[model samples]
Target: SLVTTMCLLANVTFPCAQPPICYDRKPAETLAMLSVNVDNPGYDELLEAAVKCPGRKRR
Candidate 1:
């Protein structure tokens, strides 16, 4: 499940500088909501973070 979230982050090009930012619960929940497969939770959170992220890669 952790790896799944990480993959989603990478796919979105999210700038996860550290583990703390990478593993936040709120983001995890948002990501989970976005996911079609409920088994894989936290996908929506990461997706939301990705959208909100103002990383250099975002543009």
Candidate 2:
């Protein structure tokens, strides 16, 4: 689970960075309503974050 992985490997909290730019239980429950594709869920969101991430290359 990405939620668990992030919780383990990174200091990044679930979708927060600054004050007021955050979520409550109400907002968090909205994610529960999103249908998971099971086949390839979150692929697009990963790409979206990847572009925001710094570029890297194999050594």
Candidate 3:
């Protein structure tokens, strides 16, 4: 039998109008908000860093 590998969602950042206005989530989730998906093969990666920067989500 043959095996198929799949990779969903790439590294990305997100922006908001509230505190810690900057954050990140999977492409699918983010896209869902704006309406898009990994299938686009092209996505926008905004202000992404190796670690959560000054802007981290608030509780």
Candidate 4:
């Protein structure tokens, strides 16, 4: 069986700049759509990280 999961984050605040000034705005959060095989390892860590810290970067 194939299972696909999609995670969507809303109201994600981040820094952005034009030419003069930089400001923070809420924008859509992007994540790689997870499509996994049934026997493959699940992305518990990835989900946990995103849930705990919505706007943080991953290494």
TM-score-wise, the better of 1 and 3 is 1
- TM-score between model 1 and native: 0.26
Relative to the true structure, candidate 2 reaches a TM of 0.23
**lDDT score for candidate 2 against the true structure:** 0.29
Runs off by more than 4 Å, candidate 3: 1-16, 19-23, 36-59
- Cα shift from native, residue 14, model 1 (Å): 11
- Per-candidate TM-score against the hidden true structure: 0.26, 0.23, 0.22, 0.24
Candidate 3 lDDT tens digits, 1-59? 96332223335433322212223545444445333333432223222221235534584
| Candidate 2 residue 47 C-alpha distance from true site, Å | 0.4
Tell me, by TM-score, which candidate is best: 1
Tell me the spans in candidate 1 whose CA falls farther than 4 Å from its real position.
1-39, 55-59
TM-score for candidate 3, please give it: 0.22
lDDT of 2 by residue, 1-59 (tens): 33522211132333221112212334443233222311334434433432342225564
- Looking at model 4, how many pairs of residues clash? 0
- Model 4: how far residue 16 lies from native, Å: 26
> What local distance difference test score does each model get?
0.41, 0.29, 0.33, 0.28
